[PDB]
Amino acid sequence: SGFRKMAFPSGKVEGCMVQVTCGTTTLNGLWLDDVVYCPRHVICNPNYEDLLIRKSNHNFLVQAGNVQLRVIGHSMQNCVLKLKVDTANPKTPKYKFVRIQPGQTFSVLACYNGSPSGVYQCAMRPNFTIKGSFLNGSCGSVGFNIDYDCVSFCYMHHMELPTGVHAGTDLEGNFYGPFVDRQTAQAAGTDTTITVNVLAWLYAAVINGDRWFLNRFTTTLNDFNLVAMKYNYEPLTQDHVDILGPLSAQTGIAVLDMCASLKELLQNGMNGRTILGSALLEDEFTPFDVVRQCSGVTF
Amino acid sequence: SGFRKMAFPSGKVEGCMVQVTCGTTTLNGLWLDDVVYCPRHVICTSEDMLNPNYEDLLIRKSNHNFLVQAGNVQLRVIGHSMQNCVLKLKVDTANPKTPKYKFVRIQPGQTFSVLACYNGSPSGVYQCAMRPNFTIKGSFLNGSCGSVGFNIDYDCVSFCYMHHMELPTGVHAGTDLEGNFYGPFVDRQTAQAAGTDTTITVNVLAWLYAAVINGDRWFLNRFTTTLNDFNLVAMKYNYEPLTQDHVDILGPLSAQTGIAVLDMCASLKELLQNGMNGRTILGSALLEDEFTPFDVVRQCSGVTF
Numbered sequence: 161s162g163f164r165k166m167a168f169p170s171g172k173v174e175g176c177m178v179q180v181t182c183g184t185t186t187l188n189g190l191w192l193d194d195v196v197y198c199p200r201h202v203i204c205n206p207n208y209e210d211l212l213i214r215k216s217n218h219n220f221l222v223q224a225g226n227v228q229l230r231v232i233g234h235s236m237q238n239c240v241l242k243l244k245v246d247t248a249n250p251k252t253p254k255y256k257f258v259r260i261q262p263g264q265t266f267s268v269l270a271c272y273n274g275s276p277s278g279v280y281q282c283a284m285r286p287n288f289t290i291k292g293s294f295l296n297g298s299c300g301s302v303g304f305n306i307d308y309d310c311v312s313f314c315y316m317h318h319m320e321l322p323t324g325v326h327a328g329t330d331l332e333g334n335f336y337g338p339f340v341d342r343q344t345a346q347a348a349g350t351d352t353t354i355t356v357n358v359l360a361w362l363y364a365a366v367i368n369g370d371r372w373f374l375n376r377f378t379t380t381l382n383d384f385n386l387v388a389m390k391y392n393y394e395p396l397t398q399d400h401v402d403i404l405g406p407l408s409a410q411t412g413i414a415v416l417d418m419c420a421s422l423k424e425l426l427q428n429g430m431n432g433r434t435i436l437g438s439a440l441l442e443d444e445f446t447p448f449d450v451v452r453q454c455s456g457v458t459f
Numbered sequence: 460s461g462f463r464k465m466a467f468p469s470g471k472v473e474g475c476m477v478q479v480t481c482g483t484t485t486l487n488g489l490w491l492d493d494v495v496y497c498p499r500h501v502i503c504t505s506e507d508m509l510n511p512n513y514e515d516l517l518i519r520k521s522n523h524n525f526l527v528q529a530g531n532v533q534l535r536v537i538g539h540s541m542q543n544c545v546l547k548l549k550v551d552t553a554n555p556k557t558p559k560y561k562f563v564r565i566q567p568g569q570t571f572s573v574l575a576c577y578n579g580s581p582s583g584v585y586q587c588a589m590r591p592n593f594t595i596k597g598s599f600l601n602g603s604c605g606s607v608g609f610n611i612d613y614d615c616v617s618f619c620y621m622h623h624m625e626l627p628t629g630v631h632a633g634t635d636l637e638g639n640f641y642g643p644f645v646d647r648q649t650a651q652a653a654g655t656d657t658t659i660t661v662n663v664l665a666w667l668y669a670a671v672i673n674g675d676r677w678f679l680n681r682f683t684t685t686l687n688d689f690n691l692v693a694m695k696y697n698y699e700p701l702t703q704d705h706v707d708i709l710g711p712l713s714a715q716t717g718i719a720v721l722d723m724c725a726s727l728k729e730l731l732q733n734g735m736n737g738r739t740i741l742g743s744a745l746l747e748d749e750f751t752p753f754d755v756v757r758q759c760s761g762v763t764f
């Protein structure tokens with residue numbers, strides 16, 4: 161029993177975190193094989209090709225623990241700088257670089273000066289930002305998922321927006337969201353609630369014995385989406401209904417039967433009650449996260 | 460900016476998790492140097508659990524009855540002893556991944572990270588607090604016994620909890636790493652229940668100071684309170700009494716924000732009376748009590764917004 165916001169074990173990622181320094185800027189890098197990946201803004205309206213051409217290998221100081229790595233090459237890929245080093249990381253895990261979609265969750269290993277400080281779970285919001293917990297010096301911290309023994313790196317931290325939310329790239333340097341890596345007026349767009357995730361969390365509550373919100377009613381996909389659009393909820397697709405199939409079979413509550421429960425919660429509120437210790441509808445657990453936590457999958 | 464329920468990086472603890480098997484029972488062990496620590500109920504069957512005589516069950520076991528697996532490697536047990544509700548298995552290999560560590564017993568209200576494990580394999584990490592009724596609100600399934608709670612301030616891991624059981628309300632009970640249970644619990648299948656739980660007042664105040672640091676002040680008021688009047692009100696909402704020690708501990712946060720502890724107490728009194736009226740504090744519609752004053756200082760900026 162119990163249901164917590166759970167992150168993946170961070171050990172395989174901790175063994176990859178390094179400190180990158182260029183002039184006065186210090187941030188975090190990810191050391192995989194003989195390459196250190198970090199935000200390109202470590203070098204400085206920026207013309208990154210012009211700033212980079214003026215740098216030599218010895219201008220980049222890379223520290224792994226109490227050991228200085230020597231940079232033997234450098235290149236830029238989108239908004240990420242790739243620093244070739246002479247030493248392959250002996251702690252390099254089995255890994256892939258994957259780009260995630262809004263609604264997907266991942267673990268973040270927040271780092272300062274190449275040293276991991278904490279791990280938390282979060283979701284890529286529909287507006288492509290993350291509601292993270294980052295201070296200055298956290299740039300280069302990464303987001304990941306673990307599948308069997310393979311680490312899938314999906315996020316690298318670059319900046320904080322004026323509302324306190326965060327923006328970054330995948331490990332190929334492509335931003336999530338209409339953001340740019342420069343000091344200019346940028347803002348998070350209007351956000352929405354991840355509907356399939358709220359439904360998954362309602363199924364996690366039922367499995368754990370919280371059933372007060374269930375009702376005898378069902379709905380159609382179209383009627384549910386007309387209601388959900390009114391409350392700034394993301395549209396629910398047939399793919400989402402299909403993905404919730406296993407949870408629907410385990411609890412005996414059809415997906416549109418759970419949608420009718422959700423419609424009632426949106427129109428009436430919780431009336432002083434809580435679901436899994438929360439007075440708000442939680443949207444940062446995916447259907448797979450619910451299945452994994454209620455089954456004990458290990459890595 | 461931002462405020463998340465943050466766990467310590469689990470790598471130093473992952474390298475210590477092993478699987479312990481005795482007969483038909485399998486659970487998790489913590490391998491530090493040449494000793495594997497695990498719940499003593501690994502020697503019990505389901506029937507034994509009503510009134511187990513652990514001394515009588517243990518005397519019938521030999522070293523070779525304990526199977527310890529670290530990854531895909533079998534460790535050899537060369538000795539065994541019981542210390543309170545923990546079994547200590549001496550092995551013939553020191554763990555090369557043993558971090559710098561201490562065993563610490565914590566008090567109610569303290570927080571810690573939990574590395575939940577099944578078959579000696581880590582599955583996830585989350586943040587917890589020792590409730591005032593000495594239970595923890597964890598996420599544990601059968602097979603998670605032996606999973607541990609810890610903190611990693613600096614490079615040293617302080618082990619504070621080892622998981623032993625789930626109570627009928629779905630909450631969890633366990634011991635420190637010397638095998639002493641937190642609370643009035645026993646490792647017996649006897650009728651046991653969590654006592655009435657309360658809210659950790661000093662932690663809610665710490666979290667209100669975190670909200671002020673992150674730029675929010677909507678909940679503040681022009682009032683103050685005496686400590687005694689605050690406690691008379693707090694007890695009516697099932698909040699733990701706030702002591703002079705708690706007021707002292709909140710001193711640094713009070714100095715950073717410019718809000719006296721007793722002025723923050725008046726704000727808490729008003730929130731209890733009025734609710735949030737559709738508003739949130741750090742993204743929550745409930746008052747959060749699983750962040751300590753120390754956690755707030757560790758996570759938040761030193762410069763208030």
Ligand SMILES: O=C1N(c2cncc3ccccc23)CC[C@@]1(O)c1cccc(Cl)c1
Nearest residue numbers: 201294295296298318319320341342343460
């Ligand atoms: O947003 C930024 N940083 C920051 C990142 N994360 C948290 C912060 C908290 C507080 C202050 C800054 C934070 C660090 C670099 C930064 O100022 C910047 C500026 C322009 C473009 C880019 Cl890509 C990055």
Ligand SMILES: O=C1N(c2cncc3ccccc23)CC[C@@]1(O)c1cccc(Cl)c1
Nearest residue numbers: 161500508599600601623624625646647648
């Ligand atoms: O509570 C217990 N366990 C469990 C531990 N954690 C989560 C569980 C979830 C679901 C079922 C059991 C869980 C495993 C051993 C257990 O049945 C037991 C019984 C009596 C005393 C003791 Cl010390 C331990």
Ligand SMILES: [Cl-]
Nearest residue numbers: 425429430441
């Ligand atoms: Cl609601």
Ligand SMILES: [Cl-]
Nearest residue numbers: 491560561562
């Ligand atoms: Cl010791």
Ligand SMILES: [Cl-]
Nearest residue numbers: 564565566569
């Ligand atoms: Cl303590």
